[PDB]
């Protein structure tokens, strides 16, 4: 679909068997989800945003459905205030800022 | 134009007579620019992102040129790590997400 930006670009995602809402975020290199129960092994990572840094867990090769489009990639899990879908997954669903 | 997301969606802006680069940021409600010299009155504001909060100066009715598109609106100025163009200005230049 085409999505305009008068409101937050929120979409429905399915990940780890669970349904969540997340913001399509072109300003985010990586994908960051609030604390959730994911199955696999993870690695420590620290990521920086506008007000400082947070500790997250890095999960690779995670299947996520984003507004009906399947993608597999890295998902970071930790104390983000909002679920954000970053460019790493946006490119997979063919998302652009486009005409 | 169309912009894909394999790389950061950086564009050239002109504001306050100065040229800068900024990230087109669908995950940002507001526009936040790094410390710069901007004409006139402003108000204190506190904004939150991934790692906490920063203090910014809020300037209203500011003319900004974003990739050759003129817009007028609120620009926040403060210790953001990256110049970010948020939805407040993205809607003015007719910018959409598509996939
Ligand atoms: C390592 O991978 C990363 C590295 C960094 C990030 S990020 O989230 O911190 N960030 C990078 C940017 C600052 C360069 C993306 C950015 O879009 C961020 C995403 C976000 C975070 C928290 C709440 C809502 C939205 N937006 C942001 O901080 O917005 C501020 C400023 C603009 O106005 C408001 O809009 C809502 C909150 C407030 C993600 C993955």
UniProtKB/TrEMBL annotation, chains A, B:
Primary location group: host cell
Membrane topology qualifier: Lipid-anchor
Gene Ontology CC terms, in alphabetical order: host multivesicular body; virion membrane
Limits of the Peptidase A2 domain: 20-89
GO terms, molecular function: aspartic-type endopeptidase activity
Record's subcellular location: Host endosome, Host multivesicular body; Virion membrane
Superkingdom, natural source: Viruses
UniProt keyword annotations, A-Z: Aspartyl protease, Host endosome, Hydrolase, Protease
GO BP of this protein: proteolysis
Protein name listed in UniProt: Pol protein
Originating organism: Human immunodeficiency virus type 1
Residues of the full protein shown: 1 to 99 of 132
């Amino acid at each position: 679909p085409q999505i305009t930006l008068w409101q937050r670009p929120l979409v429905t995602i399915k990940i780890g068997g669970q349904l969540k809402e997340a913001l399509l975020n072109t300003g985010a290199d990586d994908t960051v989800l609030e604390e959730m129960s994911l199955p696999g092994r993870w690695k420590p990572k620290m990521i920086g945003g506008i007000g400082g840094f947070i500790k997250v867990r890095q999960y690779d090769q995670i299947l996520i459905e984003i507004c009906g489009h399947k993608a597999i990639g890295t998902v970071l899990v930790g104390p983000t205030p909002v679920n954000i879908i970053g460019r790493n997954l946006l490119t997979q669903i063919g998302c652009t800022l486009n005409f």
